[PDB]
């Protein structure tokens, strides 16, 4: 496995988005993973619709702006046999009735793979598959104020994640050893948060914040 991976510089990652005041972290996390896999499959990088996921994934168990799972979004894409593009079904940060139009479908998947809960497998999956959809514990106030460096909430939980985010790679900082490894994580709170909307999560520090607890990716 390589020592550093960054899927942004290879063209797998859409620009950073802003979810607003609606609990659709899962939707954005699912669309990023599916964008990565669609690009790997065809070489075409198309922003997908979070609103479609929010509005139409009800039957699969999701709760719109009131919570959602990324596996449930992949299941909705598979059952629905399609996912509209961001441009056709633009984000409105609210719950609305499903307006899916198969004419504007630009993505689909045949299921999803759940990663074993250990950071080594997460590293392997990120290296070989691409951006991976994950969950982390971000309820602590420190996460709200992140700016740069490796983020390390001493009170983070490894088994109770509440935020879905995407992992676009991993790397290390050139310091004198002292466990410098980090996960490159993309967030959905815009660009003015963290490093242009990104965060370096602590890597190989005993599954800090349960990043490797709920890792999965859609199979196209
Ligand atoms: C999410 O991190 C977020 O969007 N935060 C910003 C925000 C804006 C407005 C209001 C609140 C937060 C957050 C969103 C939920 C729902 C909205 C209300 N409060 C929240 O905390 N997290 C999730 O939505 C979460 C993501 C997740 C996925 C996978 C995993 F292993 C852990 C977490 N999913 C749920 O909370 C959830 C999912 C389901 C599915 C079925 C029934 C109930 C569910 O609850």
Numbering used by the authors: 1 to 220
Please share text taken word for word from the publication where this structure appeared.
Cathepsin L (CTSL) and calpain-1 (CAPN1) are host cysteine proteases which play crucial roles in coronaviral entrance into cells and infection-related immune response. Here, for the first time, two peptidomimetic α-ketoamide compounds, 14a and 14b, were developed as potent dual inhibitors targeting both host CTSL and CAPN1 with IC50 values at low nanomolar level based on structure-based drug design. Meanwhile, 14a and 14b also showed weak inhibitory activity against SARS-CoV-2 Mpro with IC50 values at micromolar levels. Interestingly, the crystal structures showed that compound 14b occupies the S1, S2, S4, and S1′ subsites of SARS-CoV-2 Mpro, while 14a occupies the S1, S2, S4 subsites and the extended sub-pocket close to the S2 subsite.
To elucidate the mechanism underlying the potent inhibition of human CTSL by 14a and 14b, the crystal structures of human CTSL in complex with these two compounds were solved at 2.4 Å and 2.9 Å resolution, respectively. C25 from domain I and H163 from domain II constitute a catalytic dyad at the substrate-binding site. As a peptidomimetic inhibitor, compound 14a occupies the S1, S2, S3, and S2′ subsites of human CTSL. Apart from covalent interaction, four hydrogen bonds can be identified in the complex structure. At S1 subsite, the hydroxyl group of this thiohemiketal forms one hydrogen bond with the Nδ atom of H163.
